[PDB]
Copies of this chain bind each other. A is one copy, B any other.
């Protein structure tokens, strides 16, 4: 009955309403510490994140999963400061996203396994903060290196029970390619969330993965307007999977952040202008939309509370 957060271990009952795919800052390893003035200042980024997380908490959120890896510039000290000041649980990540530096991309499957295990079992850097989830990312056709990452993630998950979350580049469906590799390693689908699955209308693809026991990440809902399908279209994929009997396979989030340096310079302003609700978009907009579409409150509670707790609880 324990999940590791940036403030230490918590019990399952304390997790509450969870956003399973979020970020405080999307960056690169070392970048926030080397050039904080890219974000105005570290202090300004903290203040923005604390204000935003407090608004999410007032809307009912109790935990977020920050799926920033080392190569996404995860700064666990930043996460800890924001978590404590907003009084919202934050689960930190290990793994490898789409921008590994040489010191990561030259590593073998065995070495990557050891790195993920260090971050889960011992702690991140010198902080003692342990990761509670393993993040992986692929580009449509899984590359040799990305296959090594997925295998190491499966091996680390089998050793520790922590789950795996995935990202696929270019709005492409990658769940079937990912699931093949995970299953060749003996990983249970119930440990894996196929992220950004709301980027497709292919309900056959979604239902087939859910039927195998994968978690389906419908987690970019407010990104609809940026680059196009409406956010309501994406949200109705939640209803569609409920209607086919797969409510227990659904995880919902925003994939939001309070700063971003890994893309074009004022991309944060673009995102904020399109979705001023930020991480509160799920509770303030999506949940009432599903209720008015007739989904029972208990089912919505199961998706936002029970499913994330079952996913995060380490299970061997």
Residues of A whose CB lies within 8 Å of any CB of B are: 27-31, 33-35, 37-38, 70-71, 73, 99, 101-104, 106-108, 111, 115, 118-119, 124-126, 261-265
Specify which chain B residues have a CB less than 8 angstroms from the CB of A262 in the assembled complex. Answer: 101-103, 106
A99–B71 CA distance with the chains assembled, in angstroms:
12
From B29, B37, B125, B265, give the contact of A29 (CB < 8 A).
Answer: B29
Q: Evaluate contact between A28 and B102: CB separation under 8 angstroms.
A: yes
Please name the residue on chain B nearest to A70 by beta carbon: B34
Q: Give min CB distance, A277 to chain B, whole Å.
A: 26
A257, chain B: closest CB distance, angstroms: 13
- Distance (whole angstroms) from the CB of A107 to the closest CB of chain B: 8
Q: Are B101 and A28 in contact (CB under 8 A)?
A: yes
| Chain B, residue nearest A263 (CB) | B106
Determine if A71 and B126 form an interchain contact, defined as CB atoms under 8 angstroms apart. no
- Least CB distance from A103 to B in Å reads 4
Residue contact A101 to B71, C-beta cutoff 8 Å? yes
How many copies of this protein are present in the complex? 2
Contact residues in B for A70 (Cβ distance below 8 Å): 30, 34
How far does the alpha carbon of A125 sit from the alpha carbon of B71 in the complex, in Å?
A: 18
Q: Which of chain B's residues have a CB closer than 8 A to the CB of A71?
A: 101
For the complex formed, measure the closest distance between the CB of A305 and the CB atoms of chain B, giving whole angstroms.
Answer: 32
Roughly how many angstroms separate A157 CA and B191 CA in the complex, as a whole number? 52
Bound complex: CA A29 to CA B100 (Å): 11
Q: Is the CB of A29 within 8 A of B101?
A: yes
Q: Do A34 and B125 form a contact, CB below 8 Å, given A71-B101, A73-B103, A103-B73?
A: yes
A sample of 30 inter-chain contacts (CB < 8 A) reads A27-B103, A28-B102, A28-B104, A29-B29, A29-B31, A29-B34, A30-B30, A30-B70, A30-B73, A31-B103, A33-B126, A34-B70, A34-B115, A34-B124, A35-B103, A35-B115, A35-B118, A38-B103, A38-B111, A73-B103, A99-B102, A102-B261, A102-B263, A103-B261, A103-B262, A106-B261, A106-B262, A106-B263, A106-B264, A111-B265
Smallest Cβ distance from A113 to chain B, in angstroms? 12
CB-CB under 8 A from A124, the residues of chain B are 34
Cα separation A99 to B99 with both chains bound (whole Å): 10
Q: Which residue of B lies closest to A76 (CB)?
A: B34
Could you tell me the distance between the alpha carbons of A29 and B71 in the complex, rounded to whole angstroms?
Answer: 9
Q: Which residues of B contact A119 (CB under 8 A)?
A: 34
Closest to A42 in B: B126
| Residues of chain B with a CB closer than 8 A to A38's CB | 103, 111
> Roughly how many angstroms separate A111 CA and B27 CA in the complex, as a whole number?
16
A-B contacts besides A31-B103, A34-B125, A102-B263, 17 pairs, CB < 8 Å: A28-B103, A29-B30, A29-B34, A30-B30, A30-B70, A33-B125, A33-B126, A34-B115, A37-B118, A71-B101, A99-B101, A99-B102, A101-B101, A101-B262, A103-B261, A108-B265, A111-B265
